[PDB]
Symmetry: C2
Subunit: 280 residues, 2 copies
């Protein structure tokens, strides 16, 4: 038990996708090729972003860059702003997000609910921060604490739950998830594969880390999200579907090569905020 919602963060579960795996059981036909989904919607605000956000705020607090009542500014497409907004409420900070306008209304309403101000993006944010040296722009595209939240949280957990791991599949945006988790995994698990999926350059990006990079179209992503919820029950956001497409490629490949695989993949958030789009 916890004294704050902020502590009820991480230690997310890992779930075997038996129905969707290319081959769950070892058989006379070859070794298993299993997909394991890690449910990051199970964090305080519904997404993996609670990890880096919280750690970024705590990290600047400790660096002495924040004082109560202070204004925090972050460019975000939604999830980090929501995470940050939650944390700024409890800690007594103001939040301003710089966001693209083609975003789902659900994001707006949660930002508003948490008391965030929205300006309808990195460049914009950078300009405003230059204009207001009072403000703190944690900057998820370059803040080492993004990568650390994953090196120190996601990665270790994944290793603890899946020591037989062969591949890790995540989305590539700020790149924190793959740089943190991936470097930790490569530092502990020999010949481990680190696989991005991106839509068809931050400062956190390390080119040495990725093993693979699938580009995934929007139609494939949506299609795959639906398959996931039809077949495993998992009500995931759309990034998960791009991720899952790239997991089925690696899987198909392990199946064809008769090699054993256990393929951890990230469910970065749930479908809730994507409903308005009518992709579900």
């Amino acid at each position: 038990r916890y004294d704050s919602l902020l502590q009820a963060l991480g230690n997310t579960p890992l779930v075997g996708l038996q129905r969707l795996s290319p081959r769950w059981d070892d058989g006379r036909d070859g070794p298993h090729v299993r997909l394991w989904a890690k449910l990051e919607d199970r964090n305080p605000t519904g997404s993996i972003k609670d990890r880096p956000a919280v750690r970024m705020i705590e990290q600047a607090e400790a660096d002495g860059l924040l004082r109560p009542g202070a204004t925090i500014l972050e460019p975000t497409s939604g999830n980090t702003g929501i995470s940050l907004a939650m944390a700024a409420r409890l800690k007594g900070y103001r939040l301003i997000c710089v966001m693209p306008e083609n975003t789902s209304v659900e994001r707006r309403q949660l930002l508003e609910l948490y008391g965030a101000q929205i300006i309808f993006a990195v460049a914009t944010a950078k300009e405003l921060a230059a204009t207001n040296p009072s403000w703190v722009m944690l900057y998820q595209y370059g803040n080492p604490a993004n990568t650390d939240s994953h090196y120190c949280g996601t990665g270790p957990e994944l290793l603890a739950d899946l020591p037989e791991i062969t591949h890790f599949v995540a989305g590539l945006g700020t790149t924190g998830t793959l740089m943190g988790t991936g470097r930790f995994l490569r530092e502990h698990v020999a010949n481990v594969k680190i696989v991005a999926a991106e839509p068809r350059v931050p400062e956190l990006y390390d080119p040495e880390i990725l093993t693979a990079r699938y580009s995934v179209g929007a139609v494939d992503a949506v299609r795959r999200t639906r398959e996931l919820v039809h077949t495993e029950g998992i009500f995931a956001g759309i990034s998960t579907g791009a991720v899952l497409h790239a997991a089925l490629g690696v899987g198909a490949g392990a199946l064809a090569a008769g090699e054993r695989a256990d393929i951890a993949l990230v469910v970065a958030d749930a479908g809730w905020k994507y409903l308005s789009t009518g992709a579900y």
Copy 2:
């Protein structure tokens, strides 16, 4: 630990202290009065109903009453439908939900996504009408299996064997348990396990301003009615002060738990009060309650 199936990643939900919101968080001018939030939005479909939906099916499975291909029928205000819709996809069953039209669009959406048939019963009569409609649909077509959540003891048992033990493990110093009073499973099963293990424990109900066959009034200390308006206000207050983005029934439980908390404070008595967050705010956004 890991799970071979989403069906297993269920229960063992977190319990978090509400420091800002508890009347008196520090035991120092009075003993403390503490609110503890058990977060049942941490469940496969984001609701406490995962506990009972799963256990009803499995227990039906056991008793011989189900074998896939089979079609389940259930009346629901949404949460139970969703749980059952998810569990029915994995187990190879078809689902019909009877649900009133007043319900939020988000519930409809999810139900269809999981691919349940939904008969929207008329708003007039609420759940009585959703239930009566299912009984009549059951009466045509006896092959459809109605688990019946208002009377299936696998509902009360899911909380007796899960929710309760989990509470007692995390908050052994517990003095009250507050939860909404719907099918009555949560309060009956959690309340029965706790009365057995914790002497003097208070079981407190919240209900909105027919009697389910699960309902044993012996288990309850007190029934608090709560208006929608107070529920919305307390739900909003919960996010503003503790960051917890809860559903509206959680506001009603919060409103009732502060009553009890306020009671303990004013009499200088220690209270450690556990309240259920039955679901998150996601399915309530279209209502406008969060604007």
